[model samples]
Target: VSEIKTLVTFFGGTGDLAKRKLYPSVFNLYKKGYLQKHFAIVGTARQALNDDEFKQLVRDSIKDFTDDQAQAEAFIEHFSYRAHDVTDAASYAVLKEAIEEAADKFDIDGNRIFYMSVAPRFFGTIAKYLKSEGLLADTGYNRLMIEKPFGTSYDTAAELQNDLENAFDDNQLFRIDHYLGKEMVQNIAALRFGNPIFDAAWNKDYIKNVQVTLSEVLGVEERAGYYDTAGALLDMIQNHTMQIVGWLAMEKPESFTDKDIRAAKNAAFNALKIYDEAEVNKYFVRAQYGAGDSADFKPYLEELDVPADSKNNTFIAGELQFDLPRWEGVPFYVRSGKRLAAKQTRVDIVFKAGTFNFGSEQEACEAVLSIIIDPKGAIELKLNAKSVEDAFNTRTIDLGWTVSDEDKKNTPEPYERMIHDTMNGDGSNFADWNGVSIAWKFVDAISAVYTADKAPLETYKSGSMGPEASDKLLAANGDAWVFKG
Candidate 1:
């Protein structure tokens, strides 16, 4: 485990995300020896906290992860705090001094990573000030890590991109879509390209349809304020779901490098068909959660902080089509929502049933390659097999592999892996500008009809997978979700 010499500055250091995810992830990296000696972290927010107070916060954040008190304390010592206001230009000087001091203290070269854990509104401001205030390192590399909700629409996302490009190049900016860092999500490439059998059949010829599901049993909860406006469309589908689908739909890359990987993904993204109002109505379904069987599950409109007239979508199910020859006429089904029957992130690749017919009562079924990403990592391949009966019969059997206890213990959390990748300048697991822009453009078309009330807003039971229209949307093409929950 070689150490990476870099200085990381968290913009929203006092926020919940920094405490709950960032600090713990960094500690895990430290524990793994990737941040042994030459790395320093500067935490900045509006709060006026002294060095000791901030250090204590870091300590409390990683308390659950700390087995060795001495090692934890040593890791916390590398973190410093600075009070900052992003809108104020003069405030950046204090941050600059803090960063330089931390870099010098750790004997770190100019490899600096600026993480925008703050709100989306402050992304451009902080990025612009990082360069204008001379905060970026001149010797090593300068990288910016940004959180999601990149934009509400394509136009806004483009504006944010323009603002960011003023400071850093496309390669230097790491857009954090934690889903991409999931172990199973990254396995898509290996599952496809690593095996000749699947790789040869991964096309319109031998494939029936592909389904991606990201479901959550919990409601909006405390994030109602943000979720109500963004809804599942912008919050999940635009970023996380789309990024995962990119891995599935991307053409075979020339090589495994980030550059070639992104090129392959961009080709698929570029071919995505943007929907008009009519197309959206035909190919997509949007719904809000209504009453459930239990009192604990309430309607989405009744959630706290939600407006009575709010027609925001709690669930989204849609189909994506690509113009590439490899994926011609193949329908990529994607669905995501809050307050579903279960909490799971998975992908199902349904292969075409064989044409060979046997003199049996039962017919052959489609073979499905299912990869589960959350709750636990598992892979299952459902294949048609002969039943051991007097009469010849066919049955579906699942050949599955679940992550072992040892493997689970060794697998890095999404944030931990994403942070480590960013530190090493690995963009293979991150979404590039071309992919993001294309996704926004594709989603914006559906959003326009949604905002204009041109399309219908359906409702579903809180515990149900989605509205009946969702099933019907796929049914139009003779396809259904493999995972009912």
Candidate 2:
């Protein structure tokens, strides 16, 4: 955005991700003027629809994700469209011709962006095609935007990288982690590095354990088809959940560019206490959502589109241990599930309680921090305080900051901020090849035990906390999940 003119391209234009995530993100950027007159978004698909049809589709998508109807209307002005196949050679020609025409129409310079909003399998193909056809221009940043499940496993991910190497180096790619975009998650670095108060207290010495919970009240739904292929580990923990761990656990960066911060993450990447195949089963508890009140839930085995005996895990709760110098002896509890109590994405940093007698009450020993990503846009620090009765005893009282009442307007959604960062060649927030490489290795290790252990899909009723095994996962160690309490 601080740079010269640019053009953003979506390789799989009509896909769900492009419509639900990318389009709205880019549209907001257009509305904010990060993308102006000399910029355009060219969406391509194999279906040959008129540019009007594509823009209208984009218009509809934005309205669903925003409140301002007028803003949605104005945002589509930045978009253009083309239709082609990445696998077909001539389609590349059509793609090139479309990009050139859109650039000229928008009066943009040589800037180019290729967002592979398709599947991971196509990442290498699109990257190679972009290179072979010389679609990458040196005039502006020739960026590649990637989606997750970057590989099914370490080997497949490496092969994907070998393919992506045909077009992109580390600098010109943006790997997204939506968790990083969440208000609480974005504040993690600040909470650690910005506050000297928290900095001194954030370690094994002062903490008992940490819990990271991501629960979706709905079951697999339309995603069962894709879920079977990825399950919980690859779909969520492999990329987003672990990245949060990296951010939550990384050493402070000297200089904060996407690269400097990302490199620190890469260092943390290699440092993760490997979950060996032998230990994976011992560490993870898996579950499938069972029947609830008729309308709200159905068991995974009974789901409409799911296989009769699908072995996929729709829920997971695992203990993460990283033996890095700063965080040794600390437990990082990671959990996610389909069909659970509330829709929450948050990290609960549970600090050691009254053993130090900082408070009058013994149970008052624990002070926690909770960030609710969906329901609110505020940060709440839960610490010991005198009870309302004015007794000397302490209880959990909250310290918080809400962005809605703050001066800034909408912090552009994750995709918009990421798209502009790509144009500006900022790697601070986006993951690099090294980060991706190491993460997939970690994920593949867990998946192996997942098979050998016959990771049976236990059942839990929808609208309840995850399966009893999740409770057992932590309670066995004298702890319980946040949702349980």
Candidate 3:
């Protein structure tokens, strides 16, 4: 067992993410005994609330999300709330002191995690506050966890990094693309590197193309406000989707540790063939999902917080080209947006026909690796075989087994696993700063072109498959989304 004892201080402890993701995850870890009983959470919020009042608030948040009410209430007993106006340096001093006291009371070591679950605007200020207000701890493992959209764009992300670099090294910080925390998402490595068949047939020789889809069945919902600013490219593709796709196509790490993993990840990010101005037009597709034939479903511009004439994109479909030798010719096609058929997130690897002797050119004969993150966390291998109809003809068949509902019930949620891993100093789940820098550089080109021009906003109805262009991008290339349950 790892002997790392941590004291967590949440800047936006009372916010949605802290309550819905971070706290619940930690409680699950506690329930599963991944964390020692001798740990505590100090929530520093702007509002004044007593300890019990804050605990009750956390209790309320958990009740809505979890059926295990009794366990959630029990977990809140370890939580405490403090009112601190972080804009004031004096408040930082008090909060830092409070954290030290909490650690002592809970028998926690100085190893600390300071997370900013607040708005992106506050990210820079808080990191600066840590340094200016004497809250930076050097005696133990001190880490900072930040979320997306990390910043406005590449420049903004770089600025955020510069401010954070004042208090954190690349290693000391944890930039979480929470999507990567999914059980099957992290298992991409083992699925590829661990399996001999995958490792042997992994390169351009055997692989034809790859498809990564982040399909959403509903429009922005509450995020319509921010979606107006971030759009699909910055909101989904640039950070979360691209990060996962990078892992799917990255070379096997020499070791599974965080440093080795980051090195391997960096190599892939740096090697991504940056599409130039001309390449962007030929390689990508952008769309804004406006209102369809249905009156019930409003268009993106019609959403509550969005301007009636807003030109924000609600959907994006693009083709990615990697410069690495292994994936040189393979088109890493990406699609993500709001208001699609269903919320689908998965990777489909198309193996070249007759390249592995497992499939024929008559069909899309490939080892399709399906990774379903939300609603279900899963992975599958689809290969071609003789028709089960007893005909001497060939048809592609899916042979896969994934974690069931019962499995999810027994499994740790993303937050639980992340906090638990952080306690043990496992940076595997966190995005390195360098990876962030490189990703934004690639995304800037796409964002710049799409933003400058009012690109075609292809409309697709709510609760339906994404725009036809999504299918056409692949179909034009003799490919399509190999839909699987």
lDDT of each: 0.92, 0.76, 0.77
List candidate 1 stretches off by more than 4 Å.
none
lDDT by residue (27-138, candidate 3, tens digit) is 7676666665677889988988889899888887677666676666667877887889867877887788788788878887678888888878888899998988877766
lDDT-based ranking: 1, 3, 2
Best of the candidates, lDDT: 1
Error of 3 at 348 (Å): 0.5
| Runs off by more than 4 Å, candidate 3 | 1-3, 55-77, 291-293, 355-367, 388-391, 461-464
Per-residue error (Å), model 3, residue 406: 3.4
**Model 1 lDDT tens row, 1-485:** 68799899999999999999999999998988888999899999999998999999999999999899999999999999999899999999999999889988989889999999988899999899988999989998999999986878889889999999998999998998888898889888998999999999999999999999999999989898988888999989999999999999999999999999999999999899998899999999999999988998899988999999999999999999999999999999999998999999999999988878897899898999999999899999999999999998999999999999999889898999988898889999998889999999999999899999999999999888999999998888888899987
TM-score of each: 0.97, 0.88, 0.90
Model 2, range 1-485, lDDT digits (tens) per residue? 35348888888899998878787777666656676568778899888888899988898888866677776666687778888887876678778888888888888877788888786667888888887886777576677778765777778878887777777776776777776665567778887888888888877888778888887887788777788767777777777788777887777777766667876776667777677765776788777777887765667888777889677788888887776776787778998877888887778888777555554543564777766565566567888766776557666777987766442455666677777677777766766777777777777777776676555667788888788788878876676665462
All models, RMSD in angstroms: 1.4, 3.4, 3.2
- Residue-pair clashes per candidate, as listed? 0, 8, 2
**lDDT, residue 125, candidate 2:** 80
**For model 1, what is the alpha-carbon lDDT of residue 156?**
89
Candidate 2 worst ten-residue window by lDDT: 354-363
Q: On TM-score, who's better, 2 or 3?
A: 3
